[PDB]
Amino acid sequence: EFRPEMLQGKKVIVTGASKGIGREMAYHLAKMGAHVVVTARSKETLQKVVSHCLELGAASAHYIAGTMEDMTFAEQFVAQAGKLMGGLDMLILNHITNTSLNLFHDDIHHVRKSMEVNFLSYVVLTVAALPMLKQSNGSIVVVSSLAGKVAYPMVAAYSASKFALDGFFSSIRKEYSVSRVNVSITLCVLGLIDTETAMKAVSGIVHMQAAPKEECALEIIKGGALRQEEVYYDSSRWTTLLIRNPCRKILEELYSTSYNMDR
Amino acid sequence: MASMTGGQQMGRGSNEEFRPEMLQGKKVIVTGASKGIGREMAYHLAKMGAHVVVTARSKETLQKVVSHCLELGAASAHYIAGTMEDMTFAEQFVAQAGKLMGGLDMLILNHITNTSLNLFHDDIHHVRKSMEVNFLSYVVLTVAALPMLKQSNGSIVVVSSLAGKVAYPMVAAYSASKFALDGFFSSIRKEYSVSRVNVSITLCVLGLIDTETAMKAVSGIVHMQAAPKEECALEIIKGGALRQEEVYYDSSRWTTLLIRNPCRKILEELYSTSYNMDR
Ligand SMILES: NC(=O)c1ccc[n+]([C@@H]2O[C@H](COP(=O)([O-])OP(=O)(O)OC[C@H]3O[C@@H](n4cnc5c(N)ncnc54)[C@H](OP(=O)(O)O)[C@@H]3O)[C@@H](O)[C@H]2O)c1
Ligand SMILES: NC(=O)c1ccc[n+]([C@@H]2O[C@H](COP(=O)([O-])OP(=O)(O)OC[C@H]3O[C@@H](n4cnc5c(N)ncnc54)[C@H](OP(=O)(O)O)[C@@H]3O)[C@@H](O)[C@H]2O)c1
Ligand SMILES: Clc1ccc(C2(c3nnc4c(C5CC5)cccn34)CC2)cc1
Ligand SMILES: Clc1ccc(C2(c3nnc4c(C5CC5)cccn34)CC2)cc1
Structure with missing residues (x-):
């Protein structure tokens, strides 16, 4: 259970x-x-x-x-x-x-620029931040989308970059676990949010309920503070019910006995 | 004779049962x-x-x-x-x-x-090169191939990995690029559906395969059963011919059971109604 005091004096x-x-x-x-x-x-x-x-x-x-x-x-x-x-x-x-x-x-x-800004810069920022985060037993918070977990038309380049964040950061999370790097990684899977950008983008194309940006921002921070691996935030009860992949986690665990990383 | 010959190989049950003749004369x-x-x-x-x-x-x-x-x-x-x-x-x-x-x-x-x-x-x-070669070139090849594929009502076959569906350590860059293929090609598949572009997209999710490259790469690090490359190659072609959206190929009979995500498909089908693409 989260408390606002968990962020008091945090860098x-x-x-x-x-x-x-x-x-x-x-x-x-x-x-x-x-x-x-x-x-x-x-x-x-x-x-x-x-x-x-x-x-x-x-x-x-x-x-x-x-x-x-x-x-x-x-x-x-x-x-x-x-x-x-x-x-x-x-x-x-x-x-x-x-x-x-x-x-x-x-x-x-636009596909290249999306991969560069939405993905490659996140990897550069992580490399640059890791020595300080290792010193504090810190946290990495990665903001993604439902479009980074399931497919949507009209966002091909964007979806690719968000999918790539999952692939990259979920792999290094497993690596940090075996190499005992105590830096948590939280992937935030967000639905439609009432930001000016998103409201303008979806106008007359997408007919969905938008969640408030203030509450969204807090849920991201909460997940990071609690060192949760994933955060799921959407207006719909149906979306939150279906978005989780329990079988993926089961599969990864069954394959967790097949490696030797003592090198 | 070719000028005096005509017909279709793809009739009843051709969406389900593969025959090698489906590839006869195909480009x-x-x-x-x-x-x-x-x-x-x-x-x-x-x-x-x-x-x-x-x-x-x-x-x-x-x-x-x-x-x-x-x-x-x-x-x-x-x-x-x-x-x-x-x-x-x-x-x-x-x-x-x-x-x-x-x-x-x-x-x-x-x-x-x-x-x-x-x-x-x-x-x-290595992260940039992986994105460029494993992902961006696939997009460039698709753009260049689409006019001819639209003409033939053709197929795009995208070779991926289990590492492009679930997370594995020691393949961060590689997995990032394989996940990106899923995001990109699954999105354009939905686009082709609404814009009535009759070009199928098959994402092939492969486990460990007994190729010289993979056997050398996993040596002393990963201890998993490898599937045969000959049968793997055939299953990819079968999926493409049958216009299957996805192919799942692995040594474990159990992987095939868990690797599929029925929830993702349902979520996508529920969100499909929330659009207006009349523009
Ligand atoms: N809003 C939604 O409905 C929604 C849904 C799912 C996921 N998300 C995720 O939520 C996050 C925030 O989205 P948002 O709706 O809050 O977006 P937003 O209001 O448009 O803000 C985007 C931010 O990125 C900055 N930015 C843009 N180009 C940049 C560049 N080249 N270099 C550096 N910074 C750059 C912008 O500042 P400058 O232009 O001044 O640089 C701005 O502060 C994103 O990661 C998005 O994927 C949002
Ligand atoms: N093998 C496995 O265990 C495994 C598991 C899951 C998925 N897969 C997927 O299966 C596919 C094939 O894998 P594989 O093990 O069969 O690979 P492989 O035997 O090592 O062959 C890779 C091929 O790509 C070519 N290539 C390499 N660099 C290239 C470049 N810069 N430009 C153009 N072509 C280039 C190689 O030829 P040149 O070196 O002469 O260019 C070679 O023909 C990949 O998409 C892989 O991710 C494999
Ligand atoms: Cl067709 C469709 C595509 C995407 C989406 C969702 C989405 N993900 N990122 C965004 C953005 C980003 C700030 C730009 C703006 C609008 C919707 N977004 C998941 C909610 C809903 C519907
Ligand atoms: Cl740790 C781990 C990482 C990846 C894998 C799997 C895999 N996917 N692509 C590959 C390659 C490609 C030729 C490079 C070589 C070896 C294993 N590969 C899914 C089977 C298994 C275990």
Whole structure:
């Protein structure tokens, strides 16, 4: 059972924190009295989030503006965020490249950019953050979608990148377990959320109930704090009932006796 | 006689029971067909009397596969050597292959970058290369092949792994790329359905296979029973011919029982009604 005091004085990074779910997470963490370093490209919007974080009661609040298309920025950002806070307890990976609901035709540039920003930068951020997270027995929080677990039309490139996060981070979770790296990994599987971006994107195309961004942001933080492997958040009782894959976990365990990693 | 001949091999029960004659005279591309499962698929297709265009980097190894395909009874057999790290090669290969056969019925996406079983530390170059070769090139080959496949009401065959459905340690990069194939190709399958593009997509979920590469990779690290490459290759072709959405092939009779996700399919079918794609 979660308590807001679990985040009191914790050193947290939040990516894609200038708006939407990312901004809501920064605000929640501020209220809990955490140290926060927020990122996104817009320096001006990050300034207002930092200012409001300090008002809400953050132990400290900083921003570092830049693009996650730049893997050098991604790497340097973590070192700089760690130096400002004097360490790192939680890494919240939330940013995505701009997308829309459209049929896929021939836009390989959007497929590549989606893999680079939505996936490869998450791997770069993890590599850069792991020494500090190993020191604190910290947490990695990976923001995904229902579209990163089941198939949906009109989001092929996006779905690929979210599926890749599951493949990558679920594999290293098993590796951390055997190599006794006490860094938890939480994959957050979210349904439709009432962010400005999502509401504009689904308008007249998707007829679904949207869940509130404030509660969504809190459920992500809760999962991270509780070191839960996965978080499932959706407005529908039918979605939450069916989204889980109990057989996958059973399968992985039956195959867990087939390895020797003493090398 | 060919000008005086006509008809269809795909009638009653052809959606369920496979016959080697379903591939007779079919125009098939096989990527990563110089060795392993890919080579076995080329050999099976040759025996079925299909037209084949095989690819890999090694011109010398592709020459031997082509020669043996012609011996086995392929209607035609050609090779185009190159690297799938080059997206210009991937695009141009499909056009050149289509010209050699006078069209395309089946696109078999099987190649992968060289990988090993290792714990992930900091090799971002291997994560990028895995995404580029195992995933992005598959998308480039699909884009280049789709006009010909639409013309023939063809098939796309995507070779994946159990590691592209469940998590395994020591294959983080590899698994990331195989999971991405599922996300990408399962989404466009739903798109093809609404936009009435009659091109089937088969995702093949394979367990450990007795290929030289896999046997060397797992040596002293992974102790699992390996399935035969010859039978594996045939099951992939069968799934493609039958237009099955997924193929599950593993040594364990139990894996086949658990690997399927009925909940995913139901969730997708319930969310299908929530759209408006009249735009
Ligand atoms: N909202 C939903 O319905 C929904 C559903 C499922 C999953 N999710 C997941 O929830 C997360 C947040 O979504 P959201 O709706 O809150 O999105 P959002 O409001 O559009 O915010 C996206 C954030 O990413 C940043 N960003 C965009 N391009 C970037 C780049 N190249 N480099 C660095 N940062 C970049 C944006 O800031 P700048 O443009 O200033 O950089 C912004 O802060 C995502 O991971 C998404 O997959 C959302
Ligand atoms: N074997 C298993 O245990 C296993 C298990 C599950 C799934 N699978 C899947 O089965 C498929 C085939 O695996 P396999 O074990 O049969 O592989 P394999 O015998 O090692 O063959 C890989 C093929 O890809 C080619 N290739 C390598 N790098 C390439 C590049 N840069 N550009 C173009 N072609 C390239 C190789 O030829 P060149 O080196 O001459 O280029 C070769 O023909 C893969 O998709 C694999 O993930 C295999
Ligand atoms: Cl057709 C369809 C596609 C995707 C979705 C869902 C979804 N996942 N990410 C998003 C975004 C991201 C912020 C961009 C915007 C809108 C919906 N999203 C799972 C809820 C619902 C329906
Ligand atoms: Cl630990 C572990 C990781 C992966 C696997 C499986 C697997 N998938 N692709 C491969 C390869 C490809 C030629 C590289 C080599 C060896 C095993 N592979 C599912 C059987 C089993 C155990």
